[PDB]
Paper text:
The first committed step is BCKA decarboxylation by branched-chain ketoacid dehydrogenase (BCKDH). Branched chain ketoacid dehydrogenase (BCKDH) controls the rate limiting step in BCAA degradation, the activity of which is inhibited by BCKDH kinase (BDK)-mediated phosphorylation. BCKA flux through the complex is inhibited by E1α phosphorylation (Ser337 in the full-length human protein) by branched-chain ketoacid dehydrogenase kinase (BDK or BCKDK). BCKDHE2 makes up the complex core, and BDK and PPM1k are thought to compete for E2 binding to regulate activity.
Author numbering:
A (entry chain A), B (entry chain A): 26 to 47, 53 to 306, 332 to 374
Amino acid sequence: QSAIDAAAEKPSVRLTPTMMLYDGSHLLKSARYLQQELPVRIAHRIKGFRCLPFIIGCNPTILHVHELYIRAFQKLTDFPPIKDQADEAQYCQLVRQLLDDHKDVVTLLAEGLRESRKHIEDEKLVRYFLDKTLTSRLGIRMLATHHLALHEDKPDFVGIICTRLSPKKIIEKWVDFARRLCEHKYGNAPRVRINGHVAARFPFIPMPLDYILPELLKNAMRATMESHLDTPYNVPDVVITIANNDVDLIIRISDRGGGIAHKDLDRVMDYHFTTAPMHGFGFGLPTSRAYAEYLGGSLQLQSLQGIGTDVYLRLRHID
Amino acid sequence: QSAIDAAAEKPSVRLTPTMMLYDGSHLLKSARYLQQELPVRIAHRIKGFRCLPFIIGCNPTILHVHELYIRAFQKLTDFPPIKDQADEAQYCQLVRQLLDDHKDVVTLLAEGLRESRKHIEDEKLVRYFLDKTLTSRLGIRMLATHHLALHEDKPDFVGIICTRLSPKKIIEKWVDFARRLCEHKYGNAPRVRINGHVAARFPFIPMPLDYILPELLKNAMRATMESHLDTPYNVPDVVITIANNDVDLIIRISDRGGGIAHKDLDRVMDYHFTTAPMHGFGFGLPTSRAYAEYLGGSLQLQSLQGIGTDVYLRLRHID
Ligand SMILES: Nc1ncnc2c1ncn2[C@@H]1O[C@H](COP(=O)(O)OP(=O)(O)O)[C@@H](O)[C@H]1O
Ligand SMILES: Nc1ncnc2c1ncn2[C@@H]1O[C@H](COP(=O)(O)OP(=O)(O)O)[C@@H](O)[C@H]1O
Ligand SMILES: O=C(O)c1sc2cc(F)sc2c1Cl
Ligand SMILES: O=C(O)c1sc2cc(F)sc2c1Cl
Ligand SMILES: [K+]
Ligand SMILES: [K+]
Ligand SMILES: [Mg+2]
Ligand SMILES: [Mg+2]
């Protein structure tokens, strides 16, 4: 479509998490902003699918995701200008439907690429496509969820921004989730100890942490159980340190799971790479790093082969 | 001198720590090897001084070190071929004298460069000169000390190679040294806990660890005391983890000393850089990294601003 070609050239206007902390006229300004911003971001994704190597773009699962993005651009651009609160309520129902229609895009992309990637000349190309597609999708989802959340009245929240986020509380929520998955598979899970700036509270968007934290915790718990198959009733603790400063929030997850082997170290950050249904599909580590870098931070690993691994998640503060 | 020009072109023949684990005829073969190898390594250092920027090479302290290296090449090349045990005993006395004559070369280089570096166009140049000079000097010293040590009969030692090196024991020797320096300055020192592969024993050359370990321990202890000036009677422990695998030995030193600030992070590995007589002269960190890389390993830092720093020393095993 020619409409897609016009918007794929338009530059995306990035919204700062600080800018987001800005009658009902504010919901209209937000919906109108979204209606200008979303089609441009969708069009840049469509350009990405059009630029995929022919043999990969031809995959029926990859074609399905490409078609979904075209459909999202069509539905968003065909929506009439939002003049009043009634149009704004209709818009919310469309954004909510598109949020659900695209809930499994990461799963579908992994399936489509799984076999087709093995037929290409550039290994770096698929990593670039996934880093760009998944981080842009995360940005689209945060914008969409923020607008819908501006209608709710949660205490300590302005849309998706938590004004008093406690890292200890959000880590504990995901430790409980990971211990349950771990206990279901092994009958036992490593005890998690949290130290450092346990009392820290500050404005923050939980959404990225809601993806990254269960991933890293599942990895630390699985490694601990797999390295202690001979004593599953006596496994070492996972230790989490919170460090909070004016520049960034640092979360260190240290495990005693044997470390990442020297042979595997240069492949752990590749998509699809896994040494394994509790783990995933080899997307946890590369996706979490792309998300952290997209949000002005980083994801770094330090392997102590024979002992364990320290993972450092760094996320920039809201200004 | 023209003799220096001829040997500065000759390639150095690197001796593997494994090759070193090879009547009195073996001392002669070693002294004869040294007599061919040392002048070439000394000549490459002289070439380095000749290539220093004119304003830096002119410094009287830098000129003194340049002259010392010329003198070492002259004395080693003028020494007559070693035919017997008597010539070999005379050679040992010269190597021992040169080891003492050059004991302070790192101190003299730091002094000479301290002011003169501030008059140059290439910042990277001084780092390259120091990394190359200090690591080559370390290689010269290990060769010289190994030959002299082949005359001694220490149990568990073939020259300078320890056949059953315990990382826990060598770390404890340097923890005692650092706690004494720390207790003398503050009246108290952080307690050091050692965990991981505490029972590990393997062939290893202690000499590089004898430089790196007191440096990193002095840094961890100083940072802990400087960050707890309000409670000097209650400071947090320094935690050392030993990880031993077939490829390398990893030693992690974790402190609760507040971390390395974001402003200072990109300068801590520069020579002369210090935030400070117990510390040194800003050479500890860059020298330790150059030494670790020279020996097929690495020195990496992870800063948790507001909490502490984790330092990872990795050293390749003897094959
Ligand atoms: N804490 C850890 N300890 C040991 N191995 C780990 C750890 N974290 C990650 N790994 C390794 O990295 C591989 C890839 O990780 P990831 O991308 O998250 O996908 P998956 O969870 O599906 O295996 C894992 O299969 C595992 O071998
Ligand atoms: N463990 C640590 N914690 C905090 N700061 C550290 C640590 N290790 C090194 N540093 C910082 O790095 C700087 C440079 O270190 P170094 O090169 O070893 O020289 P020096 O010991 O003379 O200060 C120190 O002055 C200090 O600010
Ligand atoms: O890929 C996604 O996850 C999503 S969620 C969403 C909501 C919209 F309004 S468009 C859109 C897209 Cl394209
Ligand atoms: O710079 C040094 O530390 C040394 S020690 C030593 C022993 C020798 F035989 S030459 C020589 C040099 Cl050049
Ligand atoms: K992976
Ligand atoms: K320094
Ligand atoms: Mg995972
Ligand atoms: Mg030091």
